[PDB]
Scaffold this motif. Structure first.
Motif, PDB file in Angstrom:
ATOM      1  N   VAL A  45       0.833  -1.185   0.000  1.00 56.94           N
ATOM      2  CA  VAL A  45       0.000   0.000   0.000  1.00 56.94           C
ATOM      3  C   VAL A  45       0.874   1.244   0.000  1.00 56.94           C
ATOM      4  CG1 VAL A  45      -2.000   1.112   1.061  1.00 56.94           C
ATOM      5  CG2 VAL A  45      -1.569  -1.330   1.443  1.00 56.94           C
ATOM      6  N   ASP A  46       0.521   2.226  -0.827  1.00 56.34           N
ATOM      7  CA  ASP A  46       1.289   3.459  -0.858  1.00 56.34           C
ATOM      8  C   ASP A  46       1.040   4.125   0.484  1.00 56.34           C
ATOM      9  OD1 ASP A  46       2.170   3.168  -3.538  1.00 56.34           O
ATOM     10  OD2 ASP A  46       0.365   4.162  -4.311  1.00 56.34           O
ATOM     11  N   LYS A  47       1.723   5.233   0.728  1.00 55.16           N
ATOM     12  CA  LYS A  47       1.580   5.963   1.977  1.00 55.16           C
ATOM     13  C   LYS A  47       0.157   6.502   2.122  1.00 55.16           C
ATOM     14  CE  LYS A  47       4.076   9.530   4.580  1.00 55.16           C
ATOM     15  NZ  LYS A  47       5.123  10.584   4.504  1.00 55.16           N
ATOM     16  N   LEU A  48      -0.387   6.383   3.329  1.00 58.38           N
ATOM     17  CA  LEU A  48      -1.728   6.875   3.641  1.00 58.38           C
ATOM     18  C   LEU A  48      -1.559   8.211   4.352  1.00 58.38           C
ATOM     19  CD1 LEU A  48      -2.736   4.418   2.517  1.00 58.38           C
ATOM     20  CD2 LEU A  48      -3.114   3.512   4.796  1.00 58.38           C
ATOM     21  N   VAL A  49      -2.084   9.275   3.755  1.00 60.86           N
ATOM     22  CA  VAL A  49      -1.944  10.603   4.329  1.00 60.86           C
ATOM     23  C   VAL A  49      -3.225  11.408   4.251  1.00 60.86           C
ATOM     24  CG1 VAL A  49      -0.619  12.722   4.307  1.00 60.86           C
ATOM     25  CG2 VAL A  49       0.419  10.581   3.520  1.00 60.86           C
ATOM     26  N   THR A  50      -3.635  11.969   5.380  1.00 60.03           N
ATOM     27  CA  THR A  50      -4.841  12.779   5.425  1.00 60.03           C
ATOM     28  C   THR A  50      -4.443  14.220   5.645  1.00 60.03           C
ATOM     29  OG1 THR A  50      -5.074  12.427   7.814  1.00 60.03           O
ATOM     30  CG2 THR A  50      -6.294  10.949   6.353  1.00 60.03           C
ATOM     31  N   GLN A  63      -4.700  11.869   0.410  1.00 53.40           N
ATOM     32  CA  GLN A  63      -4.079  11.763  -0.894  1.00 53.40           C
ATOM     33  C   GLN A  63      -4.426  10.421  -1.537  1.00 53.40           C
ATOM     34  OE1 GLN A  63      -0.091  14.527  -0.211  1.00 53.40           O
ATOM     35  NE2 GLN A  63       0.074  12.297  -0.547  1.00 53.40           N
ATOM     36  N   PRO A  64      -4.541  10.395  -2.868  1.00 49.16           N
ATOM     37  CA  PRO A  64      -4.863   9.132  -3.533  1.00 49.16           C
ATOM     38  C   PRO A  64      -3.732   8.143  -3.234  1.00 49.16           C
ATOM     39  CG  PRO A  64      -5.296  10.975  -4.970  1.00 49.16           C
ATOM     40  CD  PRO A  64      -4.458  11.498  -3.836  1.00 49.16           C
ATOM     41  N   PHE A  65      -4.055   6.854  -3.211  1.00 44.46           N
ATOM     42  CA  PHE A  65      -3.055   5.826  -2.951  1.00 44.46           C
ATOM     43  C   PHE A  65      -3.359   4.530  -3.695  1.00 44.46           C
ATOM     44  CE2 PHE A  65      -6.281   5.617   0.392  1.00 44.46           C
ATOM     45  CZ  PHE A  65      -6.605   4.261   0.423  1.00 44.46           C
ATOM     46  N   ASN A  66      -2.308   3.811  -4.069  1.00 45.28           N
ATOM     47  CA  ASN A  66      -2.479   2.561  -4.792  1.00 45.28           C
ATOM     48  C   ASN A  66      -2.307   1.354  -3.893  1.00 45.28           C
ATOM     49  OD1 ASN A  66      -2.844   3.378  -7.670  1.00 45.28           O
ATOM     50  ND2 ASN A  66      -0.807   4.267  -7.394  1.00 45.28           N
ATOM     51  N   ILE A  67      -2.983   0.272  -4.253  1.00 45.50           N
ATOM     52  CA  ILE A  67      -2.860  -0.970  -3.522  1.00 45.50           C
ATOM     53  C   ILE A  67      -2.427  -2.000  -4.555  1.00 45.50           C
ATOM     54  CG2 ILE A  67      -4.091  -2.830  -2.350  1.00 45.50           C
ATOM     55  CD1 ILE A  67      -5.799  -0.803  -0.984  1.00 45.50           C
ATOM     56  N   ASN A  68      -1.172  -2.426  -4.484  1.00 43.40           N
ATOM     57  CA  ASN A  68      -0.671  -3.420  -5.419  1.00 43.40           C
ATOM     58  C   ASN A  68      -0.864  -4.811  -4.854  1.00 43.40           C
ATOM     59  OD1 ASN A  68       0.828  -0.839  -6.171  1.00 43.40           O
ATOM     60  ND2 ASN A  68       1.384  -2.210  -7.863  1.00 43.40           N
ATOM     61  N   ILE A  69      -1.618  -5.620  -5.588  1.00 42.69           N
ATOM     62  CA  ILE A  69      -1.939  -6.977  -5.187  1.00 42.69           C
ATOM     63  C   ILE A  69      -1.207  -7.988  -6.060  1.00 42.69           C
ATOM     64  CG2 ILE A  69      -3.798  -8.617  -4.794  1.00 42.69           C
ATOM     65  CD1 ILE A  69      -5.718  -6.271  -4.555  1.00 42.69           C
ATOM     66  N   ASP A  70      -0.483  -8.891  -5.404  1.00 36.45           N
ATOM     67  CA  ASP A  70       0.292  -9.932  -6.075  1.00 36.45           C
ATOM     68  C   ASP A  70      -0.372 -11.307  -5.896  1.00 36.45           C
ATOM     69  OD1 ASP A  70       2.341 -12.088  -6.285  1.00 36.45           O
ATOM     70  OD2 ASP A  70       3.688 -10.385  -6.688  1.00 36.45           O
ATOM     71  N   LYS A  84       0.519  12.774  13.259  1.00 35.78           N
ATOM     72  CA  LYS A  84       1.806  13.172  12.720  1.00 35.78           C
ATOM     73  C   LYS A  84       2.769  11.993  12.625  1.00 35.78           C
ATOM     74  CE  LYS A  84       5.061  17.037  13.033  1.00 35.78           C
ATOM     75  NZ  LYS A  84       5.774  17.951  13.983  1.00 35.78           N
ATOM     76  N   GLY A  85       2.859  11.212  13.695  1.00 35.95           N
ATOM     77  CA  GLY A  85       3.746  10.062  13.697  1.00 35.95           C
ATOM     78  C   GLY A  85       3.182   8.873  12.944  1.00 35.95           C
ATOM     79  N   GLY A  86       1.897   8.939  12.596  1.00 37.33           N
ATOM     80  CA  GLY A  86       1.256   7.851  11.867  1.00 37.33           C
ATOM     81  C   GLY A  86       0.548   6.846  12.760  1.00 37.33           C
ATOM     82  N   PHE A  87      -0.764   6.703  12.588  1.00 33.32           N
ATOM     83  CA  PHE A  87      -1.512   5.763  13.408  1.00 33.32           C
ATOM     84  C   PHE A  87      -1.682   4.395  12.732  1.00 33.32           C
ATOM     85  CE2 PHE A  87      -4.008   5.352  17.257  1.00 33.32           C
ATOM     86  CZ  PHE A  87      -4.777   4.228  16.988  1.00 33.32           C
ATOM     87  N   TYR A 127      -0.914   8.789   8.208  1.00 34.28           N
ATOM     88  CA  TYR A 127      -0.244  10.011   8.642  1.00 34.28           C
ATOM     89  C   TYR A 127      -1.155  11.201   8.375  1.00 34.28           C
ATOM     90  CZ  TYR A 127       3.991   7.109   8.498  1.00 34.28           C
ATOM     91  OH  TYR A 127       4.922   6.120   8.718  1.00 34.28           O
ATOM     92  N   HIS A 128      -0.910  12.310   9.063  1.00 33.23           N
ATOM     93  CA  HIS A 128      -1.707  13.500   8.822  1.00 33.23           C
ATOM     94  C   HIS A 128      -0.794  14.689   8.541  1.00 33.23           C
ATOM     95  CE1 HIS A 128      -4.249  17.013   9.723  1.00 33.23           C
ATOM     96  NE2 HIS A 128      -5.166  16.273   9.127  1.00 33.23           N
TER      97      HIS A 128
END
Ligand SMILES: *[C@@H]1O[C@H](CO)[C@@H](O[C@@H]2O[C@H](CO)[C@@H](O[C@@H]3O[C@H](CO[C@H]4O[C@H](CO[C@H]5O[C@H](CO)[C@@H](O)[C@H](O)[C@@H]5O[C@H]5O[C@H](CO)[C@@H](O)[C@H](O)[C@@H]5O)[C@@H](O)[C@H](O[C@H]5O[C@H](CO)[C@@H](O)[C@H](O)[C@@H]5O[C@H]5O[C@H](CO)[C@@H](O)[C@H](O)[C@@H]5O)[C@@H]4O)[C@@H](O)[C@H](O[C@H]4O[C@H](CO)[C@@H](O)[C@H](O)[C@@H]4O[C@H]4O[C@H](CO)[C@@H](O)[C@H](O)[C@@H]4O[C@H]4O[C@H](CO)[C@@H](O)[C@H](O[C@H]5O[C@H](CO)[C@@H](O)[C@H](O)[C@H]5O)[C@@H]4O)[C@@H]3O)[C@H](O)[C@H]2NC(C)=O)[C@H](O)[C@H]1NC(C)=O
Ligand SMILES: *[C@@H]1O[C@H](CO)[C@@H](O[C@@H]2O[C@H](CO)[C@@H](O[C@@H]3O[C@H](CO[C@H]4O[C@H](CO[C@H]5O[C@H](CO)[C@@H](O)[C@H](O)[C@@H]5O[C@H]5O[C@H](CO)[C@@H](O)[C@H](O)[C@@H]5O)[C@@H](O)[C@H](O[C@H]5O[C@H](CO)[C@@H](O)[C@H](O)[C@@H]5O[C@H]5O[C@H](CO)[C@@H](O)[C@H](O)[C@@H]5O)[C@@H]4O)[C@@H](O)[C@H](O[C@H]4O[C@H](CO)[C@@H](O)[C@H](O)[C@@H]4O[C@H]4O[C@H](CO)[C@@H](O)[C@H](O)[C@@H]4O[C@H]4O[C@H](CO)[C@@H](O)[C@H](O[C@H]5O[C@H](CO)[C@@H](O)[C@H](O)[C@H]5O)[C@@H]4O)[C@@H]3O)[C@H](O)[C@H]2NC(C)=O)[C@H](O)[C@H]1NC(C)=O
Ligand SMILES: *[C@@H]1O[C@H](CO)[C@@H](O[C@@H]2O[C@H](CO)[C@@H](O)[C@H](O)[C@H]2NC(C)=O)[C@H](O)[C@H]1NC(C)=O
Lengths: 674, 674
Positions: free
Chosen positions: B443-448, B486-493, B596-599, B656-657
């Motif tokens: 999963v790409d970075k998750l940011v709000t 922000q938009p994010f991608n989920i790469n599934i293998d 900030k530190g990421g939940f 993250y925010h």
């Protein structure tokens, strides 16, 4: 006073020694013992053919591959995961095709699983497996000493083992530590001698009696609530009846102890008000002190809202069923007079497997008793499925120590007794024995006293690597003054006309209510403690019967320590009671502590025609050899009549108490050092 | 980022223009508009032949002749008389034979009836009538701005309108009033920036998000509790399933916001103890402020005694049914595993029409949800059938602003999830996809972050006689920073043996519980947020799927103001999501505000065989294209197993925010003036 013994063959003896080889130094593993090698490498999968039920074994393996409760953690059958694991383990033990496969499974368990969990499933399997019928079980207080003795004496044993003996024996005596022969004896007080937080503490000698507590444990392992009563054939249809009888009898006996101590009726409570009687267990697990419930505990808090609503709903359902005259649900509709109604209320209140027509209960079939024990125990919610802070209510071996235990089951039997007033009461004619009359009943003096009692508590301690190379020490002895009474005779005078086989029963009941006023059969029929049950051929004319208290069939002799069991095995014998009546209430407790001036009670003898025994419960409890409802004729109200039947007699009686009134006096150093 | 659009023909465009013609300056009447003349002289009685159900029209006329709620008074579907009038109005709209008759009926209503009442029935008719299928609905916050914005900014608009502009723009800036182009922009804070009465106020940017609140409103009008689900064919049989799904997802999503804010699980309450979390609606009606519920509100007072006994009884019934294994009443008998059971518990808790097998609910059919909203709202009893003091719980568009809203439904779904444990758990075999394996998920970075959002709030104001002679101004804009990511991608293998049509779902679940410890599937299966659902053709060997968050089928794009709708119609187009997925949760809210530190959280991808879609719910929600229960495989517990299936994958993720943490920081004059 000699103890009745029984003869056993060479096969039994060999199986007895095997089962006992797994009951030693239980909290530790001994690599030098045969069982360790056998158990460590036993391959269940490879012997799956040595089990009568392949599915059960596969479920166990499937579950086991996922992990079980770790060693040293507390085990309690009241916690889902722990129970399911214990049950899977029981199935692995029960379905072993022969004693040998069973023993290997047991050794496997002892080596790989949690000690508490193993002991629980082990104890039950020995009771349930046919090939182990008659096998003598070791006293529960000998196996779980940490559940039968307060920390103050446990810590003294710990200090002794750590010091590897007594450093200053002369000083040790002042702390109740004495050396006798090769044993270390620890005088152990009941909690009322160290803390007196509420008036119920005055009953500690009774509620903490190791025999009384062992008695409840035996009740449970004899037939777990989670298991079907199928194995016992007839008991299944009479299970609810047995439930009522057991608790009514226990509650009534506890009530008598209350009476001679001026504590009145068993207290009533509300799930919406503070619970008055608190309780402080002076017990501990390996990871945490047992939870405490202070007096006037605020039980109606956010953590219990949902649980309280469930308990409320559970009670509501029953009360509404009584009102509308029918129990709906559970796949059927039963009117109150149905012939299976009695068994239904019993199974309903206990939420047992038989209520659902299954062999074992499921996690989602929520139990009134379990949830009630949860909120009354006052423990914070479990950390996780394998970790919880235990309370006295988490163990059948410590339940009777908590005053709320009696309050909980008194509440339950309260409803059960209400249900009983909707039934057809016993008519005067069915109670009458035409031709039989009891002219008189004389009871010898009733006297109680405290008497020292010892038991092996060595399992409390951990053995050294070197100590494990030699035979187990059975070194530590716990000594407590326990309630007891002098033997007494009951002389029955019966005037008969014709000759017939009769059944005679002996009960003990209160004379006055809590306020000192005359008892009333209409409201106090459920307050009669059954003491004896036996057949007797009545001859026309005068009949004189003499029953000694030592003969009452309802009670058993104290258990013998495992060490004495071995010596007795050399003779190819086993204690009679310990083998066939392990579930009976210890006879030393048949009488409540009396008072110096003698406390009022009454005995009653009832004799009725002996007949049908087609649906008896002998496979369960030996003394249940008739077709009449358990507790007959005090199993339900009786058609109020002011003229008593001639075949029933009530005799006033006084219970006196000799010697020191308080048990703790016998543990005072100045006293036992003479 | 371009918004997806859909092409519409001329017939659709004209109807769209007709429906929007009745959504302007809603609290006022415009005699200069075409609808005024039409609606003022429309004769329903005379045109009765243009309605497919004459009985319904006669009932409306019979009821209308007695009078309806007067103009300006508050309307709520939770009040008997009001709901009955609204439903009568709905039928008038619904049974109109063709669009034209519907429009006249609507014009008639807009002229004669209570504005809120009219709007309510109108919104629902447009959704339910077949000829208005696809017609785009204006965002609720545009139509009822007084329900989507606190009075502080409502009063600022009032002041602006009364002064007919800004008297001192330079000064107005310090109060969040700024002129842009020909618009007056009002920076509007969430309540936590004006009053912090309890810790729940830290969730205000979420609980007060206009999109989140609009979402609930759309859920209601799409299918009101008072109407049968008949129109949607299959949905009717799965109505309860949809009830559980909607609330569980919403409650889970809410829970996530609590987690990143350190507020733990949704609080539990009791009807017999003070309700801990209060609420202060900063909203007002034309006649009174909204009622307020202070913290630790004394809910068990004399005014609520009877309602509480009702609520308690309603819960008792459910709890006992679960215990006895069957639902009795409502004209039937349903065992817990009966195929109609799931829908029953759903329809029962909602007290909807399908529960009684009727078209619309009656007054005497008392509702748990309604009565609970009544006591939790803490408002004094209604002055009369037309006059009441409103609470946030009286409207679907404000309900999510009150913490007890979540507490109430969490209580209901608590019971629902309890019922789920009595059902056949998903077996490991059924969950297994033979030959299909998920090798990896990245999963790409998750940011709000917070991003300003504007909506037309002109309906807040009243226009001048002269202003009514010209086009509606669409003059006022409310600006608030709203949660986004922000938009994010989920790469599934995926590694597959053979080729098959597979369904791949994507969930977001917590990693730890409220105490910071590892989650457990046995107890947390109900905490998985469904994010995506799509079919994919798997080929033998290695497969690689790339799903972008913007493609998730569970979410929609933000609504466009009605003015932008018009411009788009001129191009023969309408926004794709606003037309077919109006009831979807705004995608900008799919992720809870991070830290900030990421939940910590976790994403899970599960892929199963694509097959039956015979009983799908496409007519209701587009993404429900399967036969599997909604929320599969987390719709119920699964046969506990420590060994993961190969076709499922769990991936740790951190949200993250960025930018300012608190939303109100963006509404600080110093900041937006740069
Ligand atoms: C402080 O505090 C803190 C906080 O709380 C804490 O912490 C904690 O801790 C704990 C403890 O430690 C922990 O736990 C733990 O963990 C661990 C780890 O885990 C991980 O891993 C695992 C494993 O893996 C592996 O395997 C598998 C299979 O099974 C696979 O799959 C994989 O892959 C791998 O592989 C591998 O394997 C092997 C190795 O091992 C080999 O073969 C190779 O290498 C391969 O490769 C796993 O399993 C797990 O899993 C889990 O997780 C995951 C994630 O992460 C997931 O996925 C999964 O599924 C699972 O999960 C879950 O699930 C559910 C949820 O949903 C639930 O149920 C839960 O959660 C689960 O978990 C991981 O990964 C482990 O290992 C351990 O275990 C144990 O325990 C248990 C209980 O607890 C049981 O059940 C089991 O069975 C076991 O047991 C054992 O141990 C014990 C002790 O502990 C004991 O008691 C018992 O008895 C047993 O024993 C045995 O073993 C041992 C070792 O282990 C040994 O030592 C012994 O030995 C002895 O003994 C004998 C007799 O018996 C004799 O003979 C001899 O000689 C002697 O030596 C035996 O053998 C546990 O679990 C936890 O985690 C923590 N927590 C946290 C939060 O962190 C601490 O502790 C404290 N501290 C203080 C100081 O206090
Ligand atoms: C302060 O505070 C106080 C205290 O709270 C208050 O007071 C109040 O007030 C209120 C208000 O005002 C009131 O109420 C009201 O009232 C009134 C009166 O009443 C009376 O009368 C009526 C009538 O009568 C008539 O009709 C009938 C039929 O229908 C008949 O039958 C009779 O006979 C008569 O006749 C006559 O007359 C006529 C006229 O009308 C003609 O035709 C001729 O002349 C003939 O001959 C009646 O109905 C009533 O009745 C009743 O009542 C009685 C007793 O008394 C009884 O017996 C009966 O039955 C009845 O009912 C009752 O009952 C029941 C049972 O129990 C109950 O439910 C109740 O009670 C009832 O009531 C009387 O008699 C009236 O009228 C009104 O009405 C209205 O409203 C309602 C609601 O509320 C509705 O529903 C209706 O429909 C109506 O509506 C209307 O109005 C409104 C306003 O208000 C609005 O909103 C609407 O929309 C409508 O509108 C319309 O109309 C109007 C007039 O009215 C006009 O103006 C308008 O105009 C507009 O339009 C358009 C737009 O859309 C355009 O186009 C134009 O341009 C413009 O202009 C429209 O048209 C009401 O109801 C009360 O009462 C009081 N209370 C007390 C206690 O007193 C006050 O207010 C305050 N103040 C301040 C400042 O705040
Ligand atoms: C639906 O419920 C019925 C009864 O509530 C379940 O049937 C019981 O199944 C168990 C097996 O676990 C048997 O021991 C009982 O005798 C059955 N009782 C009755 C009344 O049928 C049934 O299993 C449930 N449905 C499913 C799919 O499990």
């Amino acid at each position: 006073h000699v103890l009745k013994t029984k003869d056993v063959d060479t096969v039994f003896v060999e199986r007895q020694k095997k089962v006992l080889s797994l009951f030693q130094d239980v909290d530790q593993l001994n690599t030098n013992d045969e069982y360790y090698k056998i158990g460590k490498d036993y391959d269940i999968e490879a012997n799956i053919d040595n089990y009568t039920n392949k599915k059960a074994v596969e479920d166990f393996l499937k579950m086991y591959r996922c992990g079980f409760l770790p060693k040293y953690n507390e085990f309690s059958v009241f916690h889902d995961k722990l129970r399911d694991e214990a049950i899977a383990l029981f199935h692995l033990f029960y379905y072993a095709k022969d004693f040998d496969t069973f023993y290997k499974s047991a050794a496997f368990a002892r080596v790989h699983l949690n000690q508490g969990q193993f002991l629980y499933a082990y104890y039950i399997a020995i009771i349930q497996r046919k090939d182990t019928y008659g096998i003598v079980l070791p006293a529960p207080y000998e196996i779980y000493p940490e559940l039968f003795v307060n920390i103050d004496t446990t810590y003294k044993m710990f200090r002794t083992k750590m010091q590897n003996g007594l450093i200053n024996p002369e000083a040790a005596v002042e702390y109740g530590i004495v050396k006798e022969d090769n044993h270390y004896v620890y005088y152990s007080n009941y909690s009322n001698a160290i803390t007196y937080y509420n008036e119920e503490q005055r009953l500690a000698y009774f509620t903490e009696d190791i025999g009384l507590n062992a008695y409840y444990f035996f009740f449970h392992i004899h037939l777990p609530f989670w298991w079907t009563a199928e194995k016992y054939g007839n008991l299944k249809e009479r299970r609810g009846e047995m439930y009522h009888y057991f608790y009514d009898q226990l509650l009534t006996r506890y009530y008598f102890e209350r009476l001679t101590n001026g504590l009145g009726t068993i207290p009533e409570f509300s799930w919406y008000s503070p619970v008055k009687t608190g309780h402080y267990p002076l017990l501990t697990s390996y990871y945490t002190p047992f939870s405490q419930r202070p007096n006037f505990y605020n039980v109606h808090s956010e953590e219990n809202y949902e649980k309280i609503r469930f308990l409320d709903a559970y009670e509501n359902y029953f009360v509404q069923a009584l009102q509308k005259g029918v129990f709906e649900g559970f796949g059927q509709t039963i009117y109150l007079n149905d012939s299976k109604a009695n068994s239904f209320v019993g199974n309903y209140w206990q939420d047992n497997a038989d209520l659902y027509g299954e062999e074992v209960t499921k996690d989602y079939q929520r139990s009134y008793e379990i949830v009630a024990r949860q909120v009354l125990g006052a423990a914070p919610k479990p950390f996780d499925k394998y970790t919880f802070m235990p309370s006295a209510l988490d163990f059948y071996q410590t339940s009777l120590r908590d005053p709320t235990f009696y309050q909980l089951y008194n509440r339950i039997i309260g409803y059960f007794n209400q249900f009983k007033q909707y039934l057809e009461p016993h008519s005067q004619e069915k109670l009458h024995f035409v031709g039989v009359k009891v002219n008189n009943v004389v009871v010898d003096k009733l006297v109680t006293f405290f008497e020292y009692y010892d038991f092996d508590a060595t399992n409390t301690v951990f053995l050294t690597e070197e100590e494990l190379k030699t035979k187990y020490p059975h070194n530590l002895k716990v000594r407590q003054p326990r309630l007891n009474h002098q033997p007494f005779n009951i002389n029955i005078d019966i005037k008969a006309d014709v000759a017939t086989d009769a059944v005679v029963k002996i009960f003990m009941g209160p004379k006055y209510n809590e306020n000192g006023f005359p008892i009333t059969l209409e409201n106090d029929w459920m307050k009669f403690f059954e003491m004896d049950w036996f057949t007797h051929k009545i001859t026309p004319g005068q009949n004189t019967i003499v029953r000694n208290s030592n003969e009452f069939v309802i009670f058993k002799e104290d258990s013998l320590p495992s060490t004495e069991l071995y010596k007795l095995l050399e003779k190819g014998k086993v204690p009679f009671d310990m083998s066939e009546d392990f579930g009976y209430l210890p006879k030393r407790l048949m009488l409540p502590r009396g008072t110096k001036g003698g406390f009022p009670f009454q005995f009653v003898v009832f004799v009725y025609p002996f007949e049908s025994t087609t649906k008896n419960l002998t496979p369960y409890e030996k003394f249940m050899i008739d077709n009449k409802p358990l507790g007959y004729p005090f199993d339900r109200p009786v058609d109020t009549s002011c003229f008593k039947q001639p075949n029933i007699f009530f005799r006033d009686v006084s219970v006196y108490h000799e010697g020191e009134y308080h048990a703790y006096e016998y543990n005072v150093p100045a006293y036992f050092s003479h």
